[PDB]
Write an enzyme that holds these catalytic residues in place. Structure first.
Site, short mmCIF file in Angstrom:
data_model
loop_
_atom_site.label_atom_id
_atom_site.label_comp_id
_atom_site.label_asym_id
_atom_site.label_seq_id
_atom_site.Cartn_x
_atom_site.Cartn_y
_atom_site.Cartn_z
N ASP B 98 -54.14 -8.75 51.11
CA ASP B 98 -53.50 -7.46 50.94
C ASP B 98 -53.02 -7.26 49.50
O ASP B 98 -52.77 -8.22 48.77
CB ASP B 98 -52.33 -7.32 51.91
CG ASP B 98 -52.75 -7.45 53.36
OD1 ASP B 98 -53.92 -7.81 53.60
OD2 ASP B 98 -51.91 -7.20 54.25
N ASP B 152 -49.64 -2.62 51.10
CA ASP B 152 -48.23 -2.71 51.47
C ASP B 152 -47.42 -2.02 50.37
O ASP B 152 -47.13 -2.63 49.33
CB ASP B 152 -47.80 -4.16 51.66
CG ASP B 152 -48.78 -4.95 52.48
OD1 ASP B 152 -49.72 -5.52 51.89
OD2 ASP B 152 -48.62 -5.00 53.72
#
Lengths: 35, 511
Positions: B98, B152
């Site tokens: 991520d 994120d």
């Protein structure tokens, strides 16, 4: 009219407590019955 | 020579021998053979995604600014820049990893505008799928997958009325007029930048961090929520070794990494630069006057102001594990430099379920999968609080937390049977093994965490007090109800371990 599905919804919305707890205890420093 | 990196003169400025450079080629070849370098087509995709998210931020701030009755010139120059940090900005990240992003906006765009205005801007964008924008319970965070790339996003509000398209968060003055929650957010990307600037060779630092991060993951000493150092922590540890060996190759750094760190006289901290004071009068980590920062076992201080200890979660037990895993890895590092062992021998899997005699089985149960994920995350978060209370007994000399948790789904028949599964009694019941939420919006879902125990040693041991405190500490959670969720702890011997903890072929402890 789906009796199994109605019992599931009654299980989700159930206000009864989920499980309980107990104190733990480990036995012996293992001088007998060693590995 | 003409270069002085770090806060101390180096150990050796000597170049790389032909063997060291050949072993470095073997180290990089081994790292590539594990698929730790992603792919050129995927990194080009992350760049186009970040530039696509930057075009949204300008569109996001411009819309919110016009709603505040800003002029045509001010709303245009309001800007709004998105930054990245963590594993991505360090350049060390594998496939599917991520992207820790971070959005910076002026103060006239509040946190309320972050969830109310930016979230619909993402769904209507035809390239966003599986958007789980959670309203702030800890830090303003939003998770999604732009074009399949997991993101994120963390919110950060600056007091400056305008954020240019070419801003750098190095100036300590930008922290003024910013709330404490949004200051620690910016600290994530400030430290990631300071690390890449305090190392001599950046390419050597990246290859070395790849092998050290990989070795830590393969031995379950990488989870921060249980007391082991995090990614930023390991990055600062390999950065310090790169400073002491300026003209060395990555293979030399990795080999010298384990020796220097386990013989490091803790708690002498590791500093990548001299600690700098700043404008805001907040704690800046001084163990001579603050007793809290004095008790830090293995302090690793971030170079960006305010200087904090990233490894403050480390306890006595985690410290002993890290030191012992560094000793084993060092001996392997010494025999791979003499061609007596392959590089793959360093990345061997841990042996947690074969090291201790007694394992503390900690599970968290819930009726639904949505509640299970929220409940399993909190029980794991309070795990480091349990080992700290278990160290106080010192009939237990070591409480080793485990990295991940095992998820099994029970299919109970009767309502009385599910109440037993929700408790310590486990009859012969069908348990399917899963990973994450199902159905996409009487089954009892469980998540088991373990804690190894080394006993000090008369007839019996009672850990009823730490287990009861751990129960109340988990049930104190504001998003909890004992009608849906529960948590209990059980004992397990070597022979009593379940079959799930062993991969096919392993030899269970027979004692």
């Amino acid at each position: 009219i789906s009796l199994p599905l109605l019992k599931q919804d009654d299980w989700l919305s159930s206000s009864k407590p989920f499980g309980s707890s107990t104190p733990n205890v480990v036995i012996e420093f293992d001088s007998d019955d060693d590995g | 020579t003409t270069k002085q990196w770090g806060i101390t003169p180096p150990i050796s400025t000597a170049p790389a021998t032909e063997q060291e450079n050949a072993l470095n080629t073997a180290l990089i070849n081994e790292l590539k053979n594990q698929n730790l370098f992603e792919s050129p087509a995927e990194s080009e995709k992350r760049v186009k995604v970040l530039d696509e998210l930057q075009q949204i931020t300008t569109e996001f701030v411009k819309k919110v600014s016009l709603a505040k009755h800003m002029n045509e010139k001010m709303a245009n120059e309001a800007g709004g820049k998105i930054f990245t940090y963590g594993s991505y900005r360090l350049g060390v990240y594998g496939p599917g990893s991520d992207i820790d992003t971070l959005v910076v906006v002026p103060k006239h765009v509040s946190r309320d505008n972050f969830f109310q205005d930016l979230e619909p801007m993402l769904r209507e964008r035809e390239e966003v799928t599986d958007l789980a924008a959670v309203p702030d319970a800890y830090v303003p965070i939003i998770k999604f997958k732009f074009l399949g790339i997991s993101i994120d996003l963390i919110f950060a509000r600056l007091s400056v009325p305008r954020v240019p398209r070419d801003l750098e968060l190095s100036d300590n003055n930008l922290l003024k007029g910013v709330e404490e929650r949004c200051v620690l957010s910016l600290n994530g990307t400030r430290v990631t930048d300071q690390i890449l600037q305090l190392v001599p060779n950046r390419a050597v630092f990246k290859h070395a961090l790849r092998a050290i991060k990989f070795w830590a993951q393969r031995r379950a000493i990488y989870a921060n929520v249980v007391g082991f150092p995090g990614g930023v922590a390991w990055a600062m540890m390999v950065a310090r070794i790169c400073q002491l060996y300026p003209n060395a190759v990555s293979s030399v750094i990795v080999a010298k990494f384990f020796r220097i760190l386990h013989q490091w006289n803790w708690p002498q901290p590791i500093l990548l630069k001299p600690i700098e004071d700043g404008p805001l009068q907040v704690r800046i980590w001084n163990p001579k006057l603050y007793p809290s920062d004095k008790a830090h076992r293995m302090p690793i201080i971030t170079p960006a102001y305010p200087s904090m200890c990233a490894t403050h979660n480390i306890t006595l037990s985690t410290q002993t594990i890290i030191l012992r895993e560094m000793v084993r890895a060092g001996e392997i590092a010494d025999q791979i430099m003499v061609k007596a062992l392959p590089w793959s021998a360093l990345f061997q899997k841990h042996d947690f379920f074969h090291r201790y005699k007694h394992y503390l089985t900690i599970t968290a149960a819930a009726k639904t999968a949505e509640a299970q994920l929220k409940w399993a995350g909190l029980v794991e978060s309070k795990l480091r609080h349990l080992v700290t209370r278990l160290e106080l007994v010192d009939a237990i000399a070591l409480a080793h937390p485990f990295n991940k948790g095992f998820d099994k789904v029970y299919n109970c028949s009767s309502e009385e049977e599910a109440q037993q599964v929700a408790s310590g009694v486990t009859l012969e019941v069908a348990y399917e093994s899963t990973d994450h939420e199902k159905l996409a919006n009487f089954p009892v879902y469980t998540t088991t965490c373990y804690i190894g125990l080394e006993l000090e040693k008369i007839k019996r041991l009672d850990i009823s007090w730490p287990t009861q405190e751990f129960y109340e500490l988990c049930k104190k959670w504001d998003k909890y109800d004992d009608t849906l969720m529960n948590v209990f702890i059980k004992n397990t011997k070597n022979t009593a371990l379940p079959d799930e903890v062993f991969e096919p072929g392993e030899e269970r402890p027979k004692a």
